[PDB]
Amino acid sequence: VSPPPPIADEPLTVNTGIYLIECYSLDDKAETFKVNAFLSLSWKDRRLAFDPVRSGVRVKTYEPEAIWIPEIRFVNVENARDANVVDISVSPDGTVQYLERFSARVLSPLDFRRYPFDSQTLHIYLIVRSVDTRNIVLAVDLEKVGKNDDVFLTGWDIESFTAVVKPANFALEDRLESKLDYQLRISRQYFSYIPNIILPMLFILFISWTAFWSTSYEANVTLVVSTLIAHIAFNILVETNLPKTPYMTYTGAIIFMIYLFYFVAVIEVTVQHYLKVESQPARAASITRASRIAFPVVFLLANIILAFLFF
Amino acid sequence: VSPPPPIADEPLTVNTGIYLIECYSLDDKAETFKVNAFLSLSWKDRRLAFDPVRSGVRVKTYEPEAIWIPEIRFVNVENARDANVVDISVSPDGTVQYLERFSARVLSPLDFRRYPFDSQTLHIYLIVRSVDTRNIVLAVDLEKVGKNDDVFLTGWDIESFTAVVKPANFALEDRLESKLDYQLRISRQYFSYIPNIILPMLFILFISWTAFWSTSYEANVTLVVSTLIAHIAFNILVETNLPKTPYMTYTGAIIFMIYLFYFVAVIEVTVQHYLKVESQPARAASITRASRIAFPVVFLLANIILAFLFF
Amino acid sequence: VSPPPPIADEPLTVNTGIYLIECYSLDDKAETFKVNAFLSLSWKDRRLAFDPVRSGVRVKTYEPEAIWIPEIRFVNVENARDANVVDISVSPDGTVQYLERFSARVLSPLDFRRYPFDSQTLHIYLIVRSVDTRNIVLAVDLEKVGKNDDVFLTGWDIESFTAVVKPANFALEDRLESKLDYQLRISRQYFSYIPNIILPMLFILFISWTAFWSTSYEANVTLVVSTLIAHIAFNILVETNLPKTPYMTYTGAIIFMIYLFYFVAVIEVTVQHYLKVESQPARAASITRASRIAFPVVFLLANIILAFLFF
Amino acid sequence: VSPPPPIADEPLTVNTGIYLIECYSLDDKAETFKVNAFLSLSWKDRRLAFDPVRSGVRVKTYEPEAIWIPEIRFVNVENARDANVVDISVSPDGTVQYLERFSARVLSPLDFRRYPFDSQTLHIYLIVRSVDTRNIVLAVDLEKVGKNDDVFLTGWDIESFTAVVKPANFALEDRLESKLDYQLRISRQYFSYIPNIILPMLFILFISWTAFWSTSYEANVTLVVSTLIAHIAFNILVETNLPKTPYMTYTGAIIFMIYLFYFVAVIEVTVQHYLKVESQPARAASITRASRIAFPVVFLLANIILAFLFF
Amino acid sequence: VSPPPPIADEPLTVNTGIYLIECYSLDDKAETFKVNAFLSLSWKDRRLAFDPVRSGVRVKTYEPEAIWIPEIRFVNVENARDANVVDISVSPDGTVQYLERFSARVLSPLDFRRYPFDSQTLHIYLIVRSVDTRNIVLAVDLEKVGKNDDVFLTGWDIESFTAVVKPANFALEDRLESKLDYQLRISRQYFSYIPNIILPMLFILFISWTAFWSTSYEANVTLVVSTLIAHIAFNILVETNLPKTPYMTYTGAIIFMIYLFYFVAVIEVTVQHYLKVESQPARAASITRASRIAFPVVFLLANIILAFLFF
Ligand SMILES: [Cl-]
Ligand SMILES: [Cl-]
Ligand SMILES: [Cl-]
Ligand SMILES: [Cl-]
Ligand SMILES: [Cl-]
Ligand SMILES: [Cl-]
Ligand SMILES: [Cl-]
Ligand code: NA
Ligand code: NA
Ligand code: NA
Ligand code: NA
Ligand code: NA
Ligand code: NA
């Protein structure tokens, strides 16, 4: 079979639509998500046209093998989509209405800069390669674009599923390619991060500051070193849920900065002890009293500065 | 092949039934479960009708290829089900009896609010898309819905497997869709959580309270900080067996609240020491004596309040 | 094709046999094992009968497509077995000899009560559904049932591979089903558990008891708390190699009971200190001296009681 | 079908080109990467030649089955590539233009010596086996070799994608093989390693050195031992992201060397205590004062030496 | 198609050869390795013989479907190999030369007794089942057995790839089977184990022995208990990279024995303290002084004994 013939020199328009059924498995480390959707295609083939009076029928059904079907592929998929044809229906003028249900693992990159308070735009790129007979261009049939109400992406809120109606038409290996951009806008459910990582991490930091109300070096060393180890465990736990980024993430910045607070607390604890031993407890008292205000104030201001730079 | 013709303008009723053989791999993090069952279908095709006297046979067997079979799909499956046809049998009036054995990874969401004392309703949604010739509606043949006695879901108790007999009929891409709801009611086997997480977590908390019968700051700091680290390990262990929820789980609440008890214990230990050093051990004694009663009482009441809110 | 016709009213007997080649991947958490075996089938089809004088050949070979083959399935498999036909040989009377080599992930439950000193009976269930023409019954050809000598299941000892010769004939969805039980008896290689978990766990417990020969509260607190944390790590390590059971396992019981010994050791250490501070070291000495005998004796007796209840 | 016949005794030249679409999943432990690209092939088959005047058409399209296609394979792939034919176009002289889209898991080894400041050359080897009729030789059509601008390899910077134009022609299993080398030059994004591993590891080391300004043995023992354990955690974390190499990696060397600094710090702390107890605090003071300069200076010089040897 | 006919009563000899292209993924826990190789087969079929003068051609190429091909299988593979036919060439006398490229996950057991200083012999077993027409026997064509120079197995050194030329001919299910043994001899690259596990483990042990130069019970308790916990972490890390063996491994023995050294160090530290408290520091001094020599000497001798028993 060959592609439909042109009336003039016009390209063949394949109208498209994606309707998401199931959306799942958003892997932050891999920057992939799995999709299960309907893919609808529509184009005119005059060779398939018929008289509804003479033929009796209003529409004719065909098996994929019987007629010409455009070779539509996804750009950013990992492997070729798993698809099963639902229906192929031809109207009297020759307008073909194709429907298939597919599943694919889509590879769309993520911006972790504001993690875990980030929003993403996942992409699904549809493409078509022009044949030698005639050039093929993609279009968006907006009535055949949508998502099921049940569509749930665990740990995420689905905001919108829309399509950029104008295709990106370009040359590739000396043939025209027509690319379409389907955008799924989502925003992370940050709630769990608060009682599981953020508040536990702040509690251990504040426990380290109880050393500013203690003269016992042995006890202070235990307080600041033990809590520093718990902070290392939280840093490790966090960096496992995320990929290695060439930029600083919001959580990454706070986690990093907190190390400096532990380091300065060890210095203060060491200075206090050295002074007490050197028979200068009055000077050590001044430093300890100042630290009680300095540490919380500097922590609070540094956090205002960070939140400002990131949001 | 085309769908059976209507006697009048009535839709075609496809009677369904699911009989579970093997039920396994309930992933809490992924909110998926694997199923291995029989899918039975039954509809009338008058074109297949025959006289049992003339034909000799009481029933005729056909290969899927030979006759029209409705395109039945699962909504909430991850990928398309793995199915193998067991039998296709036609009675003299034209009643077709289809049977296939399938396996699928079903995606049904879970409510972790009462975890690990939770009960779930897993769903299996059967659907059918109407063709242009005629509208197709699903039905439940209750005699062909069940489960094997051996059916075991590790760490869960299987309560019931029933079907919501009235389908959810709706329009999708300007064609009628008939959806059916098969519900598998299960309840978690919480037993293991008690000697592995709950009791170990309470033991370490009670060990931290032995600091209220000690005047040694160095020993108290060690007692409260060491046990806090073991609590962090239990929080991490628990949050690995579960997905990130936009709500508070029962275990999540208890785990979180216990951090506050550790934080207040550090404050008491710090106050006691500061007072002893300031030559006020009588005042420190009053606070320590009070804490011995306050901590267990507040812990017990706070837990009554939590159990009340969650159950 | 249709099933062979009966000489009288007798059912069709399909003789079976399983010969294990490779046995591997016993997942305790999943209660699955992988198998690679030969499945042999034999039945008589008079329609295939031939004269060896006229045909030249003594036996005729056929492709599965060419003749009727019974639809034999496994009950407790995860997905449908991967099978490849080795041979199909027909003798002049019409006796078909089918041979295939398959691989499958079998789902057979396990009893962890005596873990890691447990023995299991893995099951492989073969089944056949009767057709409308005639009822099909399974049989065991004992000469075609066995296992290779090289068959090794990592961390397990293979005791026997036998078949329950009488099939379970029952009704399912108004058709006769003939089920056969192939049993693989295995016993765990507990050896590694002793130097890796049991002895390390006992060493840390005995180290905690060196606190009964020490008057230093600060040192005792460190001894009992540090070793308790190592016990938590062993509890976590053990519960990762096992699924969540609605019963107590042998190792589970010992691990749990050892927490009580740590809890009572913390109480003794606290009492000793309180008494020494209260200027009653004589009474504290009596308690400490008693604990030196009490702790090992109670530990030894409690273990005799547990081993008795479990074995 | 047979291969094209030679005009004379010349070999058949198959012109090749790889255009990367998606590049992903670089596993450092496995030394694999996944690729999704276009494979373009071109060769002359005089048997396919036609007159454009007589035939009407300028090019003829064929199904893979209709004509002879060279059996092109990848050497260093894990399993055989997943490929789907995009187009096959024949020009009047008989020049065939083949295009397929494929995906494969490529196995190319990595040099971790300068990790995480390393650069790699990933290889994709195309090969062809000569037939008895005639020898087949590969070539590079440079206009059909490239990569998409969107091509992103997480945690890596893609420098270049080029081909070694002259094939490696050699004998294998008594037939000529023509191998081509496609090279993807990449360099690691080391940025994340600095705030997550390098700086945290240096902070804990510097904290251990605060023991040179402390006379408290109990506090020093806690400082040096606790920080050594955090260093062990970083060593374990690092060796999980990497395979077992028969050489020393850059990070491996630094991590190893830091153990020696911890060991010498324990010796100093032990010596200081022994001397103070032996009533020689003046000598212990000299050693402690010297260590304050020695440790940072030796650490800084040893690091200059290492960076020099590795870069 | 039927197998070639015998000239007399001789069996049919199928000459074999395996040439490794890529060798990868040696899983110690699973006792599996993945292979990507060429499988060459050669046998004589007189029915395929032709006169090179009359036919013009020197060799005839055939599609697998056209001629009889022996059913060759691998014994110790996990699932059936993935294979693709490269070439089939028939010489004038009827000698068939078959070539296919395959990939398989091979299950060959490992001996961890000398781990990580162990050497292994991986096996690839080729087998053939005799048909009723005639018995089939395997042979090794040594010129068609080999491996690529690039063949690299990460963390291993590939020593040799040879075949045991005499097949194992035996009866199985009343038919002859011809098994061949292909042996891949490899030896572990132990280098990484030294700076990552062995030396870190020895450093922490030697740190525990600094307690023999300290009179501070509180410091000693911290030194010996903290280092014991780091030893537990190394034991856990090691037992994760290995399966559960019914024998003692070399590393397993050293790791186990080191626990006894920690246990005796706790006893010495406890004895020293009890004696100092009992006002017997002179006796405690004798024990401590002796331990300084005893511990290193006994450690060194015990290790000589172990290395002797294992190597
Ligand atoms: Cl696609
Ligand atoms: Cl489905
Ligand atoms: Cl509606
Ligand atoms: Cl409709
Ligand atoms: Cl099966
Ligand atoms: Cl390939
Ligand atoms: Cl195989
Ligand atoms: Na088509
Ligand atoms: Na059909
Ligand atoms: Na059949
Ligand atoms: Na071809
Ligand atoms: Na064949
Ligand atoms: Na301590």
- Sorted by sequence, the CB contacts under 8 Å of residue B54 that are 6+ apart come out as none
Neighbour count for residue C20 (Cβ, 10 Å): 20
Nearest-CB residue to B87 (from C2, C131, C172) = C131
Alpha-carbon torsion (C227, C231, C237, C238), positive or negative: positive
Instruction: Test C259 with B233 for CB contact under 8 angstroms.
Output: no
Instruction: Test B256 with A189 for CB contact under 8 angstroms.
Output: no
Core vs surface per residue D44-81: b (16+ CB within 10 A) or e: bbeebebeeeeeeeebbbeeeeebebbebbbbbbbebb
Q: In the A/D pair of chains, how many CB contacts fall below 8 A? A: 115
- The answer, for B117 touching chain C at a CB cutoff of 8 Å, is no
Side-by-side strand order, sheet with A156-171: A72-74, A119-128, A176-188, A156-171
Query: B interface mutation test: which of C221, C239, C258, C261 has the most B CBs within 10 A?
Result: C221
- What chain C residue is nearest to B198 in terms of C-alpha separation? C256
Q: Among A159, A148, A151, A164, which residue's Cα sits nearest to residue A185?
A: A159
- What chain E residue is nearest to C157 in terms of C-alpha separation? E246
Peptide bond preceding E3: is omega within 30 degrees of 0, i.e. cis? no
CA-CA distance, B188 to D211, in Å (whole number)?
Answer: 52
CA–centroid distance, residue A61 to ligand 4 (Å): 15
Tell me if residue E12 falls in helix, strand or coil.
strand
- The answer, for B267 touching chain A at a CB cutoff of 8 Å, is yes
Q: Which residue has the tokens 């694999």?
A: D32
What residues have their beta carbon closer than 5 A to ion ligand 2? B 73-74, 80-81
CA-CA distance, A105 to B174, in Å (whole number)?
Answer: 28
Rounded to a whole number of angstroms, the distance between the first and last alpha carbons of chain E is 56
| DSSP structural state of residue D101 | E
CA distances from E66 to A268, B186, D47, D270 (A): 86, 56, 24, 83
- Write out chain A residues lying below 8 Å of B221, CB-based: 219, 222-223
Nearest-CB residue to B222 (from C31, C172, C225) = C225
Instruction: Test E61 with D131 for CB contact under 8 angstroms.
Output: yes
Q: Six-digit token pair at A114?
A: 């504001």
Query: E interface mutation test: which of D107, D134, D229, D268 has the most E CBs within 10 A?
Result: D107
Q: Which residue has the tokens 């492989």?
A: C124
Neighbour count for residue E281 (Cβ, 10 Å): 14
Indicate the pairing of strand C95-107 with strand C60-61.
Answer: unpaired
CA-CA distance, B11 to C132, in Å (whole number)?
Answer: 29
**Count of alpha carbons within 13 angstroms of residue C43, beta-carbon side:** 22
Which amino acid does the sequence have at D64? P
Minimal C-alpha gap between A10 and chain B (Å) = 29
CA-CA distance, A134 to A43, in Å (whole number)?
Answer: 14
CA-CA distance, E242 to E48, in Å (whole number)?
Answer: 53
- The answer, for E228 touching chain C at a CB cutoff of 8 Å, is yes
- Write out chain C residues lying below 8 Å of B17, CB-based: 173
Minimal C-alpha gap between A54 and chain D (Å) = 34
Neighbour count for residue A110 (Cβ, 10 Å): 23
- What chain D residue is nearest to E225 in terms of C-alpha separation? D225
Nearest bound ligand to the CA of residue B69: 9
- Sorted by sequence, the CB contacts under 8 Å of residue E242 that are 6+ apart come out as E28, E29, E112, E115, E249
What residues have their beta carbon closer than 5 A to ion ligand 7? E 73-74, 77, 80-81
Q: Among E56, E136, E166, E48, which residue's Cα sits nearest to residue E97?
A: E48
- What chain C residue is nearest to B230 in terms of C-alpha separation? C229
CA-CA distance, A221 to A272, in Å (whole number)?
Answer: 12
Alpha-carbon torsion (D59, D64, D69, D74), positive or negative: positive
Q: Among E136, E160, E157, E138, which residue's Cα sits nearest to residue E147?
A: E160
Element (H, E) at E217: helix E217-240
Give the residues across from D184 on adjacent strands.
D122, D161
Peptide bond preceding B116: is omega within 30 degrees of 0, i.e. cis? yes
Query: C interface mutation test: which of E270, E273, E278, E279 has the most C CBs within 10 A?
Result: E270
| DSSP structural state of residue D46 | G
Indicate the pairing of strand E146-147 with strand E12-27.
Answer: parallel
CA distances from A246 to A108, C255, D156, D191, E196 (A): 17, 45, 9, 5, 28
- Write out chain C residues lying below 8 Å of E218, CB-based: 216, 218-219, 222
Residue A21 phi/psi, 5° resolution?
A: -100, -60
Catalogue the E-assigned strands of chain D.
12-27, 32-44, 60-61, 72-74, 82-90, 95-107, 119-128, 136-140, 146-147, 156-172, 175-188
Which amino acid does the sequence have at E248? M
Resolution in Å, one decimal place: 2.5
- Write out chain C residues lying below 8 Å of B19, CB-based: 172-173
Tell me if residue B66 falls in helix, strand or coil.
coil
Q: Which residue has the tokens 């009596």?
A: C286
- The answer, for E109 touching chain C at a CB cutoff of 8 Å, is yes
Rounded to a whole number of angstroms, the distance between the first and last alpha carbons of chain D is 56
CA-CA distance, C295 to C265, in Å (whole number)?
Answer: 9
Give the residues across from B16 on adjacent strands.
B41, B140
- The answer, for D38 touching chain A at a CB cutoff of 8 Å, is yes
Nearest-CB residue to E232 (from C86, C206, C230) = C230
CA distances from D299 to A145, B159, B201, D303, D304 (A): 63, 66, 43, 6, 9
CA distances from D285 to A30, A273, C170, D279 (A): 55, 16, 90, 12
In chain B, positions 163-192, which contact chain A (CB-CB < 8 Å)?
Answer: 172-173
| DSSP structural state of residue E149 | T
Tell me if residue E61 falls in helix, strand or coil.
strand
- The answer, for E158 touching chain C at a CB cutoff of 8 Å, is no
Peptide bond preceding D116: is omega within 30 degrees of 0, i.e. cis? yes
**Contact (CB, 8 A) for B20 and B148:** yes
Core vs surface per residue C278-299: b (16+ CB within 10 A) or e: eeeeeebeeebeebeeebeeeb
**Contact (CB, 8 A) for B101 and B84:** yes
Which amino acid does the sequence have at C290? A
- The answer, for C71 touching chain B at a CB cutoff of 8 Å, is yes
Q: Which residue has the tokens 């060194």?
A: E300
Tell me if residue D226 falls in helix, strand or coil.
helix
Tell me if residue E169 falls in helix, strand or coil.
strand
CA-CA distance, C286 to C265, in Å (whole number)?
Answer: 15
Q: Six-digit token pair at A269?
A: 């604890």
Neighbour count for residue B253 (Cβ, 10 Å): 18
**Contact (CB, 8 A) for D65 and D93:** no
**Contact (CB, 8 A) for D168 and D137:** no
**Contact (CB, 8 A) for E5 and E69:** no
- What chain D residue is nearest to E88 in terms of C-alpha separation? D131
CA–centroid distance, residue C281 to ligand 12 (Å): 93
CA-CA distance, D122 to D76, in Å (whole number)?
Answer: 11
Core vs surface per residue B72-111: b (16+ CB within 10 A) or e: bbbbbbbebbeeeebbbbbbbebbbbbbbbbbbbbbbbbe
Alpha-carbon torsion (E228, E229, E230, E232), positive or negative: positive
- The answer, for C207 touching chain E at a CB cutoff of 8 Å, is yes
- Sorted by sequence, the CB contacts under 8 Å of residue E287 that are 6+ apart come out as E268, E271, E272, E275
- Write out chain B residues lying below 8 Å of C256, CB-based: 195, 199
Residue D100 phi/psi, 5° resolution?
A: -140, 150
**Count of alpha carbons within 13 angstroms of residue A199, beta-carbon side:** 18
**Count of alpha carbons within 13 angstroms of residue B245, beta-carbon side:** 22
Tell me if residue B67 falls in helix, strand or coil.
coil
- What chain E residue is nearest to C151 in terms of C-alpha separation? E76
Core vs surface per residue C128-154: b (16+ CB within 10 A) or e: bbbbbebbbbbbbeeebbbbbeebbbb
CA distances from A230 to A255, B34, B225, C45, E213 (A): 12, 38, 10, 73, 31
Q: Among A126, A131, A219, which residue's Cα sits nearest to residue A181?
A: A126
Instruction: Test C243 with B207 for CB contact under 8 angstroms.
Output: no
Minimal C-alpha gap between D243 and chain E (Å) = 8
Indicate the pairing of strand B72-74 with strand B60-61.
Answer: unpaired
**Count of alpha carbons within 13 angstroms of residue C206, beta-carbon side:** 16
What own/partner pairs with CB < 8 Å and gap ≥ 24 does E50-58 have? Answer: E50/E90, E50/E92, E50/E94, E51/E92, E52/E92, E58/D132, E58/E91, E58/E92
The structure's method of determination equals: X-ray
Neighbour-count burial of D300, counting CB atoms closer than 10 A to its CB (0-12 exposed, 13-18 middle, 19+ buried): exposed
Residue D193 phi/psi, 5° resolution?
A: -60, -35
CA-CA distance, A311 to D112, in Å (whole number)?
Answer: 38
- The answer, for E222 touching chain C at a CB cutoff of 8 Å, is yes
CA–centroid distance, residue E77 to ligand 7 (Å): 6
Domains (range + CATH), chain B: 1-192 (2.70.170.10), 193-311 (1.20.58.390)
Three-state SS for chain A is CCCCCCCCCCCEEEEEEEEEEEEEEEECCCCEEEEEEEEEEEEECHHHCCCHHHHCCCCEECCCCCCCCCCEEECCECCCCEEEEEEEEECCCCEEEEEEEEEEEEECCCCHHHCCCCEEEEEEEEEEECCCCCCEEEEECHHHCEECCCCCCCCEEEEEEEEEEEEEEEECCCCEEEEEEEEEEEEECCCCHHHHHHHHHHHHHHHHHHHHHCCCHHHHHHHHHHHHHHHHHHHHHHHHCCCCCCCCCHHHHHHHHHHHHHHHHHHHHHHHHHHHHCCCHHHHHHHHHHHHHHHHHHHHHHHHHHHHHHC
CA-CA distance, B141 to B163, in Å (whole number)?
Answer: 9
Instruction: Test E155 with D277 for CB contact under 8 angstroms.
Output: no
Indicate the pairing of strand D32-44 with strand D60-61.
Answer: unpaired
Minimal C-alpha gap between B153 and chain A (Å) = 23
CA-CA distance, D238 to D236, in Å (whole number)?
Answer: 6
- The answer, for C248 touching chain B at a CB cutoff of 8 Å, is yes
CA-CA distance, B239 to B261, in Å (whole number)?
Answer: 20
Instruction: Test E38 with D173 for CB contact under 8 angstroms.
Output: yes
Q: Among C107, C108, C110, which residue's Cα sits nearest to residue C249?
A: C110
Q: Among E228, A226, E265, E240, which residue's Cα sits nearest to residue C230?
A: E228
**Contact (CB, 8 A) for B228 and B267:** no
Tell me if residue D187 falls in helix, strand or coil.
strand
Element (H, E) at D292: helix D281-310
**Contact (CB, 8 A) for D138 and D166:** no
Q: In the C/E pair of chains, how many CB contacts fall below 8 A? A: 122
Angle between helices E217-240 and C199-208 (to 10 degrees): 170
Neighbour-count burial of A135, counting CB atoms closer than 10 A to its CB (0-12 exposed, 13-18 middle, 19+ buried): buried
Instruction: Test C233 with E232 for CB contact under 8 angstroms.
Output: yes
DSSP string over C92-160: TT-EEEEEEEEEEEEE----GGGTTS-EEEEEEEEEEBPPSS--EEEEE-GGG-EE-TT---TTEEEEE
Residue C100 phi/psi, 5° resolution?
A: -140, 155
**Chains with 3 or more CB pairs closer than 8 angstroms to B?**
A, C
Indicate the pairing of strand B156-171 with strand B176-188.
Answer: antiparallel
Q: Where are the alpha helices (DSSP H) in D152-249?
A: 193, 199-208, 217-240
Instruction: Test B232 with A227 for CB contact under 8 angstroms.
Output: no
Find how far residue E119's CA is from the centre of its chain.
7
CA angle C91, C94, C95 (to 5 degrees): 65
Helices (H) and strands (E) in chain E, counts: 6, 11
- Sorted by sequence, the CB contacts under 8 Å of residue D156 that are 6+ apart come out as D26, D186, D187, D188, D189
- Write out chain C residues lying below 8 Å of E208, CB-based: none
Indicate the pairing of strand B156-171 with strand B146-147.
Answer: unpaired
Catalogue the E-assigned strands of chain C.
12-27, 32-44, 60-61, 72-74, 82-90, 95-107, 119-128, 136-140, 146-147, 156-171, 176-188
**Contact (CB, 8 A) for D34 and D160:** no
- Residue D129 falls in which region: left (phi positive, over 0), alpha (psi -120 to 50) or beta: beta
Find how far residue B237's CA is from the centre of its chain.
20
Nearest-CB residue to C225 (from B154, B215, B226) = B226
**Contact (CB, 8 A) for A128 and D101:** no
Q: Six-digit token pair at B232?
A: 């962090």
Q: Six-digit token pair at A145?
A: 């674009």
Catalogue the E-assigned strands of chain B.
12-27, 32-44, 60-61, 72-74, 82-90, 95-107, 119-128, 136-140, 146-147, 156-171, 176-188
Nearest bound ligand to the CA of residue B103: 2
